[PDB]
Each structure stands twice: as C-alpha cells, then as structure tokens.
Symmetry: D2
C-alpha cells in the first residue's frame, strides 16, 4: 500500500469513504470531483484522523471533460509516480434520444476516457488494480448499466495477462443500516488488494437481507 490511488466521486459518500480508507492504508489518494470545497473537506478530515498519512491530492475536475481529465491525470502521474489503484466510485447520472446520448456520454464515454488514461499507465507498470463501484425509461438505465459491465468484462480479460486486475463491486442500496454500509465496500477492496497476486475476481454482488425476500 505505497503508490497513488485515483478515486472518482471522492468528495461524497462511497467515494469519500473509500478514499479515506485507502489513505489510512498508506496509498497516496487523488481525490477527483468538482468541489474544491467538498474535496478539501475530505482532504482535511483524512489528515486530521491519521497519525501519519501521505496526504490526499485534491484534483478538482469534471471527468466528462475527457481531454482535460486525461491531461490532469497524466500530470499527476508525472509528479507523484506510479498508480497502483483506480477506484471508479462516481455516482451514475441515471428530447428522448438526445438525453440517452447525454446519459451514455457522462456515464460511459467519460468512464472509458478515464480507464483509457489510467490503463496506459498501468500497462507500462505491468501492475495495478481497477475497482468499479456499480449499483443495481425505454431502457435508458439498463443499457447504461450493462454498457459499463461489458466494458469492465472486456478489460478484465485483456488486462489480466498483463498483471492488471479488474473487479466490479455491485451492491444494492448503500448510504438507516438496513442497507449495505460503505465500509463493507471498502473492506472488500482491502481483502481484494491482499489476495494472492495471481487471483482474479471479476465481480462481487452485494444484496441487502431485506431485499432477498
């Protein structure tokens, strides 16, 4: 647990909890989002709750701005070294056609841009771990949800032979503790990071007890 940890949706909920979780674990986290108001908030807390932490890297950014987002990340790669972890924890953004195109762009294209950038870096490293946090209208939501899965699926198979691992975590509801707690997703990741170097888990599906029956 020594290199950088890029985390989208880092200023809120799950992204924030995992950011503070890996920072405590030793990684140097890169907090991506927009609010150089909400991020710093995560920055200050992290380092105000730890005896010793590498200190978070506040990178205000709109990942939907693909070109810029790619520049920002590369720059961060030039200054602070290798990237060991990428956690896609950004919340999903749910005339008809125009809206569907817009939902695909923000939820899938942008994500693809980030993976594209971070994957080039990791392959040069022959190592790295990618974590995807999912969830679970004439098909808008479904098409978008599967688009991300199929993307994860493809990367899983082609990045494995190169030492890079991909795991998508699919929980039902998470924030009332009748749901899946954010710490559950964080601890499952710590477990993942600690498995044998040759072990690959495609994904893990988290279901709420109440939802089962």
């Amino acid at each position: 647990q020594k290199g950088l940890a890029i985390i989208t949706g880092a200023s809120q909920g799950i992204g924030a909890v995992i950011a503070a979780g890996l920072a405590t674990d030793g990684y140097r986290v890169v907090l991506i989002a927009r609010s150089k108001q909400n991020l710093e908030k995560v920055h200050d807390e992290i380092m105000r709750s730890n005896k010793h932490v590498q200190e978070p890297i506040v990178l205000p950014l709109d990942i939907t701005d693909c070109t810029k987002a790619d520049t920002e990340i590369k720059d961060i790669h030039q200054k602070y070294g290798a990237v060991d972890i990428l956690v896609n924890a950004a919340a999903m953004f749910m005339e008809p056609v125009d809206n569907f195109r817009k939902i695909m762009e923000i939820n899938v294209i942008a994500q693809y841009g980030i993976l594209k950038t971070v994957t080039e870096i990791m392959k040069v490293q022959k190592n790295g771990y990618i974590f995807n946090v999912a969830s679970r209208d004439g098909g808008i939501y479904g098409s978008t949800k599967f688009a991300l899965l199929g993307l994860a699926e493809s990367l899983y198979r082609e990045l494995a032979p190169l030492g890079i691992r991909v795991t998508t975590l699919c929980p039902g509801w998470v924030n009332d503790e009748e749901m899946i707690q954010p710490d559950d997703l964080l601890n499952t990741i710590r477990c993942l990071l600690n498995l044998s170097e040759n072990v690959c888990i495609k994904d893990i599906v988290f279901e709420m007890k109440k939802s089962i029956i």
Copy 2:
C-alpha cells in the same frame, strides 16, 4: 391480417434474408438501409421470387438521423396501417479512441434506441407487436461495452413491453453464413456456420407461438465451436 414488418440492415446479409422471408410469409416489409440502390435490389428480388406479395417499401435511411427515421416510419404507419414486426438486423459497426468510441455508441446503440422508441410508440398504441433483435476482442473494451448496451436495452424493453402486449426476443448467433460473413473474417466453411434461414425459421416459430409466451433470447451455437 398481416401488417408491416420493418427490417433494418435489409439491403444485405441476415437482414435481406429475413426480409425476403417475411415478405414471402405475407407481411408488407419495410426495407431500411443507407443505400437506396441496394435496397431496390432486395425489393426486386422479392417481387420476382413471389407471385403474390405486398410490394416491399424501400426506405433509404440512415437510422443515425433519428428525426428523419421517426417521421418516415410514422408516415408509413399512417399510410399502410399496423406494424406487426420490427427486426433490427443492422450489422454491428466497429485518430482518437474516445471519439471513435462515441461514434460506435452512436451508430450501434443510440441509433437503435431511436428506431426502438419510434416503433414502440406505434406498438404501444396498437397494444400489439413483436420486436426481434439480431446480435452477433481487447480494444480497451469498446466491442463488449457496445454489445452489452444493446442487451441491456433489450432486457429492459422485454420487461417494460410485456404487459402492453408487445414481445421482444434477442437472437444471438455465432458466425452466420452470408456474404457478409465471408467479407468479414470468417475462418469457417459455409456449412460449418449457422445458416441465415435458421434465424428466419426461428423467427417464424416465434411468431406462431401463442400470444402470452415470452422468450427473452435464444443463443445459437456452432457444433464446430463447441467441438474446438
């Protein structure tokens, strides 16, 4: 009485086969593809091969232009009546990846969404209809993302349209023996692949099932593939 059967990618391969077949069965097929010229040929072949068939409607169209697609199809519906079937048989399309990824999503997913929205609007009003989807390697995940997005779309509509009386079935064949197969990178002999008629006859079987039977999808596999 058999109404309209709209087929996309109707000028070549699987589409041309299913279109010619449904026309023979008695539907008035609407042939959609970019080339007016190549569509007229499928149209010609049909008239020629059938004694009594409703003349296919040649609709040169780029489904990417969802606005034009909606207008044209609704005009056809107003003029010819009920739309019984939609067969999405358009071929899968595949300087900068991110923009390339967008064009691939737009052409394969966004466009089909447009056609599906138009047609389902018509079918929802009729409280009847059958939608068939014909589906079919690294690259940073572009191919799989696109494919899964179509299935996710299909999955959602299957559930949403069921109660309205509209059925949806996605057909997933491995390599299919059409000219498009040879021009693609097919390493198998004609015989070894899934045949075009297999898909058409499966669609024929689906159309004949009782009204309340729903089959989300049928996966077609090559003996050869299983062997290997």
Copy 3:
C-alpha cells in the same frame, strides 16, 4: 432421411402426451413411456383416431426407475425398429415423499428424478452414439433445498451432455417453461386461466423448429415465460 423412432417419457398425460401426438403426426414412430398401460393406450388410440395412416405408436408400460428393465426394453425396440432419432424427457417432476425422515425423502426424490433420468439417457445416448446422430429434448418445470437441488442436478446433466454429445452428431436442448396449459396443470391446481399459460403446442412447435434447424446449429436451452408472470 427416413423418420425413425421418437421416445417420449411421461407420454400418458400432460406435456409428454401432446408432444408424442405431434411427433406421430410428423411421421415418427413414437414410443410412449409411462407406468399406466391403460393411459398409454388411450394416447395410442387417440393418435390413431386423429390420423389412421400415421406410423403406429409403440406402447411401453414402464417404471423408468427400473433402469435395468428400461435399458432392456428400449434396446429391444431399437433392434426391432431401427434408428432412434429423438428422445423427449417429459416425465413430470416427482416432488414429494410422504416419509418421516426428510433425508430419506431427498434420496427417493433424487432417485426418481435424476438417477432414473440418467438411466434413460445412458441407454438412448449409447444407441445414438453408435448412430452418430440424434436429438435429445428435456422438458424442465422452504424445501430445505430439496427442490432446487433436484432441478439443477438435471440441468447439470443436460449441460454436460450438450458439450459431450455435440461432437458426436448428437444435439441436446432443454426447454424450461413456466406453467403450461394441460391437465397436469389442473391437477396441480394452477391459479391461471388456460389461455394465460404457455400452451403445450408451443413446446411441441418449438421442438419442431429445432428439428428443422441446420445440423450444426446447437441451442442448449430455451426459457418460456408467461406474460402474466412478467406482468406480476
């Protein structure tokens, strides 16, 4: 290619009875398997009344749990009538044993549904393996896990024979319908109207469609859902 023998289990009623009838009308010489000789004969007589010129159905009074007697009878018919083109496993699901110990009920349930099925399969597949051709069709349908386990065991069996038999020219397809409109549905007290359910003919017509696909086309399974079930 002349049409040969078509063996149907659970042929005296329900879905099996309907498929057997249709296959007889299609030209196959059907072998009706079930325990009731009386009821098998009624099916035999009904088919002949529907069409007197059809190949005459072979009535085979059998308890398929008697794997040895099943093997013997089936093989004699193969010796007698030739090539076995089709096997349809449509015997109903025996789901309940009135006994004290559940572990014992689980044994009996597994014996009657999986081991028995395995037996029939073993006999017919070795016949088809010699022929290098044939088509096998399976009709699927707080237990403490007893039901679910028996159901998957059957699916697990089908899935492996699918891969195992494909290269031998033998195809396997499992049909998984929700409620089907037959007398057995009535016997099971279905809460649905007849038309609301999947009709028997849909399974029969789907089997007919599979039999006409090109020889190299393999479809492991087809799932049938009732509009209502989805609407619910």
Copy 4:
C-alpha cells in the same frame, strides 16, 4: 463471544487451512473427517501454533452416515453451545447407474444431511453463516449443479432468518490434494480463508451468494 465453527474435510487441504485459520481467529472449531489420527494432527498443530486458542474438537465422522452425523453434531451443540459457522470443505468424491447413485449419496445426500442438522440449530439462534467450497455421462456436472441448487435454495430461504450463505468457487488451489498441472501459483488456500474472514466481518445485513476465484493463468 465466538462459538463453534464446524468444518468438514478438516483433516487435509483447504478445510485444514480454514480450520486452523478460524481457530486462530477465536472460534472453537469442530474437525470432521474420517481419519482420527489426521484430525489429531490438525488439532495439535493448531494447539502448538497458537499461544492461546479454544481447543479444537476432533470428530472422527463419516458424514455419509447421516443419522450418526446428526447425533454427533447435536451432542457437541448440547455440550458446547452455539454454532456460528459451518464450512463445507469436504472434497468432491468422484453399472455406471449405481455408481452415479453412490456419487450423489456421498456428495449431495450427505451434505444435505449436515446442512439439515446445522440449519435446524442456526434457525433457533436466528444467526449463523454457512460457507460452501466448490465422457463422464454427466455425473460430475450433475453432482456439482445439485450442490449449487441446494446452496442457492438455502441462500434465500435462510436470509430472512438471519442466517447467511456464500459459495466459494475457486479454480486450482495449491493444497497437496494435488493428485492431478499448474505451478504452485494457483489459488492459495489462504485466499479462501481470508475471503471468509472478510465475509464474517461485513455488516450483518449484507449478503453475497457466491464468489468466483480465477487464475490469472487460466485466463490464458
């Protein structure tokens, strides 16, 4: 307080590694298998391997003998109390007809029997966790699916009762049960042990039906 942790296939391989792991963690583990002496080994290793540990109960038992198994498990429950965990790590025992019948008895009928007994107990406690470790004519395939259908069935049947179930489906794991091709860089038994560790620590309302472990190698 941590109660009993029942482990089948505890005398060797994965079950062995899982048993010693849970012992070190705090549970009083019941070691089930046929070889008494081998169960003893695990017992003593665990003993000498930890400064302090609840002493493992050695239970020489052929779970094939259902009635005896149920009895033996009830005594331990009577005598020692609550059952927190049940780890089915027993190996897959593999006229063909009668042979298939035997394979089902040993692998599925027997396991059902164990689950029945343990489930009854956890039912009352309203708490508990069950962990499953997963030209033939379809025998192996059938058996494997049978076990899965059972686990899937219980998964949603026990969830509302406060009892969780998770099936761990690994590929090749490096245990000496290596009768039969990879170079000691398969799945390590510790990976399964640690995964179970993680699952035990998740919120009590989170449910994970199964986890598929693959070899970076197997994905060519």
